[PDB]
């Protein structure tokens, strides 16, 4: 029997036995990096619309990086 259970009629409680731990003790930190480039026809306007998306994205991350974050605290 892998898993077992016991019901205590006296205390109105049940204990489910036979489980194994996988308790988070600490943390492994790793730096994830992305190598980015610093910079009338229909085929050229689409590549412009997509390069504008790239420029707007990099400009957005430049405003966030300065501010330092937190999960929250006091629970």
């Amino acid at each position: 029997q892998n898993i077992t259970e016991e019901f205590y009629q006296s205390t109105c409680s049940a204990v489910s036995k036979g489980y194994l731990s996988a308790l988070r003790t600490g943390w492994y930190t790793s730096v994830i990096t992305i190598e980015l480039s610093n910079i009338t026809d229909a085929k050229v306007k689409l590549i412009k619309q997509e390069l504008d998306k790239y420029k707007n994205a990099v400009t957005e991350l430049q405003l966030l990086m300065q501010s330092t974050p937190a999960c929250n605290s006091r629970a």
Partner: protein, 364 residues
């Protein structure tokens, strides 16, 4: 229940420490040269941390190498590679830098499985992490750090399981009340010590809010930060609640209410008053009618448990369950002199309150 007893801390402070140093002078130039030859390389930091730096998605080797001379077959190819940085930026905008769980855009499944395999950890811990990546993901964090010079860096904090393969047990508790015909006059008692329990380094790591534990098969994935570390004598409360070795946590009330707790291999049923409590099988119908008080039914045969107007589904996990018969503790307590409001108490906090209140009666 005893979640208010837990201590508090910062879970992000560990990964933010790596983020705050990533803004230090040559730091940015250090990883840039090391990741030129290979996409994955071990890096030593100024603070002194064994950090596995990984170069994922090379935009510089695509924009300057395939879009630079011009400024439909190349727009769709660029859209595909640009999408990942567009979704990562979307995530860091609404989540204010810290994101949990770590998304597929943040780190792919192939990248994650390889990141676990590249770690300097035990051959046993690698498999546990690899087989339950979905749980690893849920437990992980992803913090934004710097953009500084032609490289976007964000710290990915993964979980470590120092305690593995040790025994664990889930304790389910329900209210134990007196069952008299009267409208009131009923005293109640509930074990507040409900939650997950894992044997850990001579002590017992207790998780009072068992909702914070993920269970895949036997494996109980919990975070020590959500635990209270208790002495092994805590398990005595299950075999003998009146033991002198440990003061068993309980709550007292007069709140005579019907409810059901669905355990791993069955269901506890606290049935009080005019409540219809029943255990049923999908085909056969009602196989058991619960009498007033606290009883239990095994999952073997039973498919559903209904208390009043709320139907619960029994867990169909295979396993043997034993009914330990015994006189309900609440009978031993005298209805008068019982402290009927103890929201957070123990077996002694009650017995001492009874000893005190009885003394005023004896002398008069």
């Amino acid at each position: 229940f005893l979640g208010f007893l837990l201590g508090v801390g910062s879970a992000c402070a560990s990964g933010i420490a790596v983020s705050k140093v990533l803004h230090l002078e040559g730091e940015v130039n250090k990883i840039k040269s090391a990741l030129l030859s290979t996409n994955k390389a071990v890096v030593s930091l100024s603070n002194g941390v064994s950090v596995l730096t990984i170069k994922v998605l090379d935009l510089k080797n695509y924009i300057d190498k395939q879009l630079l001379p011009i400024v439909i077959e190349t727009v769709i190819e660029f859209q595909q590679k640009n999408n990942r940085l567009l979704e990562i930026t979307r995530e860091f905008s609404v989540n204010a830098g810290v994101t949990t769980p770590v998304s597929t855009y943040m780190l792919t499944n192939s990248e994650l499985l390889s990141l676990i395999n590249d770690m300097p950890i035990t051959n046993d811990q690698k498999k546990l992490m690899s087989s339950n990546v979905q749980i690893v993901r849920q437990q992980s964090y992803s913090i934004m750090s710097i953009i500084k010079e032609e490289v976007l860096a964000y710290v990915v904090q993964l979980p470590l399981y120092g305690v593995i393969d040790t025994p664990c047990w889930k304790l389910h508790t329900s209210p134990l009340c007196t069952t008299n015909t009267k409208e009131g006059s009923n005293i109640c008692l509930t074990r507040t010590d409900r939650g997950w329990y894992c044997d850990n380094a001579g002590s017992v790591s207790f998780f009072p809010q068992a909702e914070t534990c993920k269970v895949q098969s036997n494996r109980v994935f919990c975070d020590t930060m959500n635990s209270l570390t208790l002495p092994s004598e805590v398990n005595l409360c299950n075999i003998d609640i009146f033991n002198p070795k440990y003061d068993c946590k309980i709550m007292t009330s007069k709140t005579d209410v019907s409810s059901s707790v669905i355990t791993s291999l069955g269901a506890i049923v606290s049935c009080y008053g005019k409540t219809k409590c029943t255990a049923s099988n999908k085909n056969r119908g009602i196989i058991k009618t619960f009498s007033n008080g606290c009883d239990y039914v095994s999952n073997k045969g039973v498919d559903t448990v209904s208390v009043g107007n709320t139907l619960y589904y029994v867990n169909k996990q295979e396993g043997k369950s034993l009914y330990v018969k015994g006189e309900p503790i609440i009978n031993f307590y005298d209805p008068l002199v019982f402290p009927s409001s103890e929201f957070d108490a123990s077996i002694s906090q009650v017995n001492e309150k009874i000893n005190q209140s009885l003394a005023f009666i004896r002398k008069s």
